[PDB]
Enzyme design. Sequence first.
Site, PDB file in Angstrom:
ATOM      1  N   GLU A 166     -22.994  -9.934  -0.603  1.00 31.22           N
ATOM      2  CA  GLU A 166     -23.311  -8.734   0.213  1.00 31.22           C
ATOM      3  C   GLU A 166     -23.890  -7.617  -0.676  1.00 31.22           C
ATOM      4  O   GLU A 166     -24.891  -7.032  -0.245  1.00 31.22           O
ATOM      5  CB  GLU A 166     -22.058  -8.290   0.961  1.00 31.22           C
ATOM      6  CG  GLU A 166     -21.627  -9.258   2.043  1.00 31.22           C
ATOM      7  CD  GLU A 166     -20.194  -9.092   2.513  1.00 31.22           C
ATOM      8  OE1 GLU A 166     -19.704  -9.984   3.215  1.00 31.22           O
ATOM      9  OE2 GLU A 166     -19.576  -8.074   2.172  1.00 31.22           O
ATOM     10  N   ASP A 190     -19.537   0.233  -0.904  1.00 32.75           N
ATOM     11  CA  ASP A 190     -19.502  -0.331   0.465  1.00 32.75           C
ATOM     12  C   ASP A 190     -18.192   0.049   1.149  1.00 32.75           C
ATOM     13  O   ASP A 190     -17.171  -0.569   0.835  1.00 32.75           O
ATOM     14  CB  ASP A 190     -19.746  -1.838   0.392  1.00 32.75           C
ATOM     15  CG  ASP A 190     -20.056  -2.473   1.726  1.00 32.75           C
ATOM     16  OD1 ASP A 190     -19.603  -1.936   2.740  1.00 32.75           O
ATOM     17  OD2 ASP A 190     -20.765  -3.485   1.726  1.00 32.75           O
TER      18      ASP A 190
HETATM   19 NA    NA Z   1     -19.785  -5.137   5.194  1.00 32.79          NA
END
Ligand code: NA
Length: 537
Positions: free
Chosen positions: A172, A196
Amino acid sequence: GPAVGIDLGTTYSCVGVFQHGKVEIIANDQGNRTTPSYVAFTDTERLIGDAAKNQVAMNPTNTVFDAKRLIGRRFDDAVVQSDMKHWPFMVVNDAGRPKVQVEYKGETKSFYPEEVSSMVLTKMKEIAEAYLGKTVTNAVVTVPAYFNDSQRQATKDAGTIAGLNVLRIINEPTAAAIAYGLDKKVGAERNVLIFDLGGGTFDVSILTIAAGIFEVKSTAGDTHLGGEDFDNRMVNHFIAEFKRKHKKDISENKRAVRRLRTACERAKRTLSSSTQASIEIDSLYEGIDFYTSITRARFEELNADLFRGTLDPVEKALRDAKLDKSQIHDIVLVGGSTRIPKIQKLLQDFFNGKELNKSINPDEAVAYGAAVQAAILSGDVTPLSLGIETAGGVMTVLIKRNTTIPTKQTQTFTTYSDNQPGVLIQVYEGERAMTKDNNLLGKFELTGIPPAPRGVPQIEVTFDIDANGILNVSAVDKSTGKENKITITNDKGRLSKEDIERMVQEAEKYKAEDEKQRDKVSSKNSLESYAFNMKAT
Ligand code: NA
């Protein structure tokens, strides 16, 4: 047809396609660009997405969420055991594997975590098919950087069950970097921090990018910190305010708490763009209307510990990456909670005013990067670290990867044993701590070392790379000036981009084990007379 990029998130999932020179995040049936990672089983039907989340209060036992937490894990994992307590749905042990057990159409059913995730992937595939007007098979699915090979394979299996050909499983943080095109920067290596903050998880990742190659230097965060926690602080505050004003606790009534939580989530979104929000609930409890307001400052005070705490994983990631904050070239914001102004101010102040990359919607950045990578698959710096074998088979790097050429690096080494007649110079390429896990390029011997105690003889080893990339390795006995050298040719096409990526990925997979090997030898400059890899035992 074009391949799709899917962010299989813990709380929400997002699907994007790169078409006509542009990434499009695809909206679902209700127009939402994000779909809840929720599957609901009922006497009459199975619900995936918004429909499942909307009915969660009515059917908690048969509504499944947080399958990503169980994916690729054994039932005996402590995370699974601690996590199971929070979930209303049941988790069971089949042959060392956790499974969710639910009642569907009056029959008990058990699903592996990948099966539940496959259902979310099936909905995302259908959302893509409705937008595209064509069958979607190829996909790139994203996973957290900390995921192990088992977790990645299980995620790939979820796609395979859903009918998707998973071209690649990508990190990610890497996907977010691809979305911002950090790989296409023309300069030397860049250090990137991915901040994040999602609904339920907080991830900090430090990546180094050069020549289109991404390395995960460090990962840190809290698996249980998210926007929902910020909402809970507001809900508890409002329950206290109602109790103070009307001497009544609304905690007893489940619907009243749910209505307050819904109002708090709306207020938090308003607080990102406005300095105040209004909470207006008719007949919240005992017929009493709750009309009140919350300032951004009060919201910041309620979450002050949580907001400031986000910096602690950033500090840990920087230490693990062995980087100062000043050495970060790019900061990327991912997740809806990054919209909160206080979070942005704290991170920017920590980075001394550094601008933050937030132009791409934080909820959609990972899917955006996955979509770019899916399209790429659908249709001068050193490639690897260079060094010599030191005592114990250890790799001692003289030229780090991503080093501009031409370059000349010189280091001084000594004998590991008393009265050592000679040293064997073994040239290796790779990112692993031990030469056995790296590639041997050449070897030569320097003999005639005058007899001396260990640690006294001085051997200068020089690595010289020309603009053409030819490597000349030389060793000189500093006592006599005697020398020996080897020329290592640069064979064109010996290493593909994928070959470098596999070696970098292997180093990321074994980083913890590799560090221990580095700590094992007392001296880092000691050379033996033999090849450790060829020694018996
Ligand atoms: Na995420």
